[PDB]
Amino acid sequence: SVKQLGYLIFECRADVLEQMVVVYQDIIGAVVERDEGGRALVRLDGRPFRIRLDPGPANRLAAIGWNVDPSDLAAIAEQVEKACYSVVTADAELAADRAAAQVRQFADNDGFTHELYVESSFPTDPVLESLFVCGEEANGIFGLGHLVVIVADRAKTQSFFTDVLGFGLSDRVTWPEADIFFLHCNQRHHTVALSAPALGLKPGMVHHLMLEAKSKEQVDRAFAAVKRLGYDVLMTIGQHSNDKVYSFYMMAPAGFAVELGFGGQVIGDLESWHVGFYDAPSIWGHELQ
């Protein structure tokens, strides 16, 4: 199965790109490097990038990078093809662009581009690693965070993630406004969550992205920074009922929410995880506006 969410690549209009650098660098506290082409490489560990912003004519999620073990790549790609998505082999330039040893790409019916990839080695970055839960940790494999997406047909997409990509269901959170399905592929409580269309959102939209700090104080600081820098909060500090994350949400200029959280529930043993069910998304806090 998929090992972890290894990278995300977004395209942004020129002004939106510069504004997103503020989000990642000056609120989230990630390291953001710039290259010769004006790209922004958002780093949370030793990897050259975990999130990359590329200039483009429209704001969109351009690629989702699913890291897989070398021994699983060909096999997973085969199951994707059996599910009737065409899988193309990336050339050397594309693989190197992703800082990956190999990449196979496909697009789904919801308009997302997926890339199954084998990782290239990269050095440790002790300072940065002390700040974010990302990739390989002492207590397991986590990837970079989670992505929550809106899709036309939740059940079908859930079946693809589950039966093709090898994700397991963590829990379902259901209340009058929404019905969300949280999926894991490693220690992180969820790497992806799925919803059908709802007030606001349409198939193929990103609901939010989440990054995970290694201390509660990072979250409080970032939250203060949103306010101090004169921005607006989407959801105030709170704790989710399912993942137990201490987090807040902000609306980013690229048109989706960004969540910074702490203390996410770990899936210790995937084989014995019990699917949970919750009637409310939060224990306390998380006040809209």
Ligand SMILES: [Fe+2]
């Ligand atoms: Fe989240």
